[PDB]
């Protein structure tokens, strides 16, 4: 239904400052706010946000509040001050997918049809992309309940823009990994993404904690993929997968062998370009 | 009677007026305390815009109610 989402770094930042402004409560508060944006060409866009007053008490945690007058007038100001801008859905600060977010989405779907949510990070530590988004799908289906509804993650990335790329690249001024040569790939995804595969091997190790001791629902629809992964584990090293591998090493290295051969001759022509400027000035200048 | 003039600048200005006074006399009293002509001033009482042609009693402004002061804004 939706291809992907596009998040600007402003709305990425426009939650953190509110997380600072309610950080004096100390005890517990999740930041929940209205997400504004304009989805076009089946691509979800996210532009602007604010945060709505929201509290939560732990005993009987089914009692939420959205001050809709604050939602009515401030969006009416925002529809005034940017008529290109509209509602796109909502968000919450999302540490660990709290329970009220099954009907918050159903509370305010009378504005946005595909009222998408966004889970963000306030304490960043990962090896992935710390912005997560779901979508609302419902089912009268296989086994669980007559009324069943579960969120599904549509893929997420941080979109840039020519206005804000001026800003963020001025705001970094920090340790950087520019000059992409032979080394940026080695550290953006060869040092890093191999350890990125750690926390996904270890993630399914964490579901594996129920062998005879963990939580009481057992499998039914979790193991059809896990049965496939050991089935779609790749081909063993006996076939011409051995032979055609040596074939292309015997082709890819020849281009490197030519290209390195050129590198020696070019700097040797540079060597004479310094022996023309060494000997032809010691008699001239002194 | 006393009134409150609560600006957008966190600041509250107290004035002594009469209920039959016009708004242009109120903005003249702010000019006596600040030095700003009444064209550069906008007075808001409970989300309503005030006009100099009417008095305080037409808008039911009484003793020690709160006004809002926003200034005129023209850039170039």
């Amino acid at each position: 239904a939706v291809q992907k989402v596009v998040v600007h770094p402003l709305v990425l930042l426009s939650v953190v400052d509110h997380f600072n402004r309610i950080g004096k409560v100390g005890n517990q508060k999740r930041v929940v706010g209205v997400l504004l944006g304009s989805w076009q060409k089946k691509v979800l866009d996210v532009s602007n946000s604010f945060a709505v007053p929201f509290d939560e008490d732990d005993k009987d945690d089914s009692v939420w509040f959205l001050d809709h007058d604050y939602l009515e007038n401030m969006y009416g100001m925002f529809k005034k001050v940017n008529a290109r801008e509209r509602i796109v859905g909502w968000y919450h600060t999302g540490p660990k997918l709290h329970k009220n977010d099954i009907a918050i989405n159903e509370l305010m779907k009378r504005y946005c049809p595909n009222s998408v949510l966004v889970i963000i990070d306030v304490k960043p530590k990962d090896l992935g992309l710390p912005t997560e988004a779901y979508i609302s799908v419902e089912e009268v289906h296989d086994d669980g309940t007559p009324t069943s509804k579960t969120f599904e993650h549509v893929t997420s990335e941080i979109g840039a823009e020519e206005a804000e790329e001026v800003g963020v690249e001025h705001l970094l001024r920090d340790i950087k990994d520019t000059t992409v040569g032979t080394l940026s790939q080695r550290i953006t995804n060869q040092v890093h993404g191999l350890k990125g595969l750690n926390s996904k091997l270890l993630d399914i190790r964490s579901y594996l904690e129920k062998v005879a001791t963990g939580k009481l629902p057992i499998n039914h629809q979790i193991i059809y993929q896990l049965q496939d992964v050991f089935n779609l584990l790749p081909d063993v090293s006996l076939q011409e997968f051995v032979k055609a591998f040596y074939l292309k090493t015997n082709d890819q290295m020849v281009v490197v062998y030519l290209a390195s051969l050129i590198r020696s001759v070019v700097a040797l022509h540079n060597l004479i370009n310094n022996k023309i400027a060494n000997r032809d000035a010691e008699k001239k200048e002194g | 009677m006393q009134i409150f003039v609560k600006t957008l600048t966190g600041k509250t200005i107290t004035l002594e007026v009469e209920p039959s006074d016009t708004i242009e006399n109120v903005k003249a009293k702010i000019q006596d305390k600040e030095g700003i002509p009444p064209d550069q001033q906008r007075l808001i009482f409970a989300g309503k815009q005030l006009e100099d042609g009417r008095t305080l009693s037409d808008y039911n402004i009484q003793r020690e109610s709160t006004l809002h002061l926003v200034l005129r804004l023209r850039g170039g």
């Binding site: 005034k80 001050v81 940017n82 008529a83 290109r84 | -």
Partner: protein
């Protein structure tokens, strides 16, 4: 106060010109506030195009002190 201020900005060096064409342009779609402008395309009457005697053409959205009825190309 207005007739004083008009007299100040009615000051006589006058770069005389020629009326090329007198428009009929429609309001735009879509305009928004925040960067709203009452000067471009909120009314339809009247815009015009002039040519000065320094061989310079100019567009004008606002005519000025003269109205649109008694003007013609």
């Amino acid at each position: 106060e207005n007739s004083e201020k008009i007299k100040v900005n009615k000051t006589l060096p006058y770069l005389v010109s020629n009326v090329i064409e007198l428009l009929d342009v429609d309001p735009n779609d879509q305009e928004e506030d925040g960067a709203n402008i009452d000067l471009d395309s909120q009314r339809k009457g009247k815009c015009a195009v002039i040519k000065t005697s320094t061989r310079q053409t100019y567009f004008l959205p606002v005519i000025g002190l003269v109205d649109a009825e008694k003007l013609k190309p």
